Design a protein around this ligand. Structure first.
Ligand SMILES: Cc1ncc(COP(=O)(O)O)c(CN)c1O
Ligand SMILES: Cc1ncc(COP(=O)(O)O)c(CN)c1O
Lengths: 353, 353
């Protein structure tokens, strides 16, 4: 006899992380390539002095720094902080959804969403993409009385694309006002070409809109786990009710504050990533690959049934890229020498096809 | 109109942390008082270089070290790691309980249990203590067909006591074998007087027993959030299914590994805390305070309706102690000079009654 566990656990689609392989360049987790700035390193060591003490459960000084960086329309009451935006995704489910409820999102999208929804006893409504892009029209139509939460992943992980900014505004305006809408903006700092939506204006104009952002990519703290949500104080308060206490570490909070102080410097680096993104995209298309327009720090190769082969052969060339079933491969844009290694491999692989 | 949130959120008993008051003596969060060893800071220093990279989702190195420390009868498959044992408490609830299900625990016990149970839509069965100690007989009598999880907090937070080690074994033997029993051993390193149970023996003897331990107290890493569970590989596999990805940070893992390597030095320090505990207990009793026999790094003062006054008066003396309703005050055993400052206050307060 064994302990009786919940029946939902069997076949639960557990999250599978990007691999780390000795000897290989990693283009599978959308990480930026630079270690911490001197001031960030200093804050980590300063926080290390008092590691025997619990963190601030409320991340008070971080919220004050985030509110200031968000501008005059936002105060700390509009900000929740979580142990990665992955934690905030679960907290959103925990404040909205229970047994038999529905959570709507585009698919393929962040692989985190389905299992977290299922843990709540709710059902994920996975709405197909159109041209590798969230289909807001289709998502709206599938709303029912039991729809408790909607995720819009923008830019989308793993397809890299963004919806039209005006289209997003129309969507939010059309959704029944009682349904929480979470706009996942993990990659927002990489959006160019006038495609960034007025996400903060949407949270101002609508009490049911919450925006998720992260320190893991542009701010370079994927190792330390700081995500934040921007929303209406009632929603922020609810998220803080289900927050697992102390999960955002002291060192994480201090490192995040120091990163905010260096934001001009850190955000300027995204311009370089975007330049490589354009170059990687141009070279891949010149080789004969087709891929959608990326607004993130990665590209999406919809290789279908060939994704497994591409990834295995990439591994043989000491390059780690990220497979998504039989849909495609997500390739991070990183250092120029890593991007060149990937491009050389990609040309060679497609020639062999 | 506001976003519709779950009804269970209204009046949820949200976890209230111990206050942190700059300039005051903090005896409110059961923290140890020493900064990290140079070897631990060095491990953090090395990990700081790659904070741009995600942590190991599987905590492979840490699990291996934990399994070595647990001895020849335990391998990594018996160990789950969480972002604090507080996260593992939620994971336990997530693998066992949903709407209508029951979770039984002694009360007063860990403030964390009721809200996490309610977040699952489950029903907390709160079984009164007897002489400030878990009443295993009464808890057994409360078991039903809907009992999905049992918490035994040993030593108990906040009352500081343990049940008899044989009584614990008999309780485990008498609980129906399909019900998961979690033994919360956050303070196990402080148990003396032959009162420590054979919890690892119980795990080996029973597939439905899981033991929770932490790096936050004896190992002095409260700021960095590492807890671990020891159990049957099926339970561990299940806990890892609901684990929020990457929540145990890269720096936390490195610090925890370093702390295991320095376990002889760190564990030896528990003897000094134990000596202070006996000393403080004698000083309080001589000053007219009754208290149960503590096996933790804190004592429990069953002040009843006077706890608010005691805490307020302590606060005015620049001493932070932890109030629990109209039941009592939990006071951490910390540095000798800090304990003496508290004792001075305690004697003063006593004389004013
Ligand atoms: C859309 C999205 N949201 C959240 C996350 C998780 O980020 P964090 O490291 O802040 O948890 C990811 C990971 N790439 C993502 O793609
Ligand atoms: C019984 C018990 N369990 C778990 C915890 C949480 O410890 P951690 O810091 O590992 O989350 C505490 C905190 N005092 C506790 O008292």
């Amino acid at each position: 006899v064994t302990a009786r566990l919940r029946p939902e656990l069997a076949g639960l689609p557990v999250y599978v992380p990007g691999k780390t392989v000795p000897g290989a360049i990693k283009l599978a987790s959308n990480e930026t390539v630079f270690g911490p700035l001197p001031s960030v390193r200093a804050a980590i060591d300063r926080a290390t002095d008092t590691v025997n003490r619990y963190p601030d459960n409320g991340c008070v000084q971080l919220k004050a720094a985030l509110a200031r960086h968000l501008g005059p329309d936002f105060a700390p009451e509009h900000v929740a902080v979580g142990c990665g935006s992955v934690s905030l995704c679960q907290q959103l489910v925990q404040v909205t959804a229970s047994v038999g409820d529905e959570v709507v999102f585009g698919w393929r999208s962040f692989e985190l969403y389905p299992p977290q929804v299922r843990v709540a006893g709710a059902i994920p409504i996975q709405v197909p993409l159109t041209d590798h892009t969230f289909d807001l029209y289709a998502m709206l139509a599938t709303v029912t009385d039991r729809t408790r939460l909607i995720f819009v992943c923008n830019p989308n992980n793993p397809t890299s694309t963004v919806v039209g900014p005006d289209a997003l505004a129309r969507f939010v305006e059309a959704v029944p006002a009682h349904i929480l809408i979470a706009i996942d903006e993990a990659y927002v700092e990489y959006i160019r070409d006038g495609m960034r939506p007025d996400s903060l204006g949407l949270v101002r104009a609508h009490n049911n809109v919450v925006v998720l952002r992260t320190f893991s990519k542009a701010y370079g703290l994927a190792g330390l786990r700081i995500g934040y949500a921007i929303g209406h104080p009632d929603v922020i308060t609810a998220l803080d009710k289900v927050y697992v206490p102390f999960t955002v570490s002291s060192i994480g909070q201090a490192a995040a504050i120091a990163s905010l102080d260096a934001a001009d410097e850190l955000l300027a680096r995204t311009d370089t990533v975007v330049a490589e993104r354009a170059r990687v995209s141009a070279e891949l298309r010149a080789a004969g690959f087709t891929l959608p327009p990326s607004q993130a720090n990665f590209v999406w190769l919809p290789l279908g049934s060939r994704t497994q082969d591409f990834v295995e052969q990439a591994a043989d060339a000491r390059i780690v890229v990220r497979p998504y079933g039989t849909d495609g491969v997500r390739v991070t844009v990183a250092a120029p020498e890593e991007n060149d290694a990937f491009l050389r491999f990609a040309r060679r692989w497609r020639s062999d096809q």
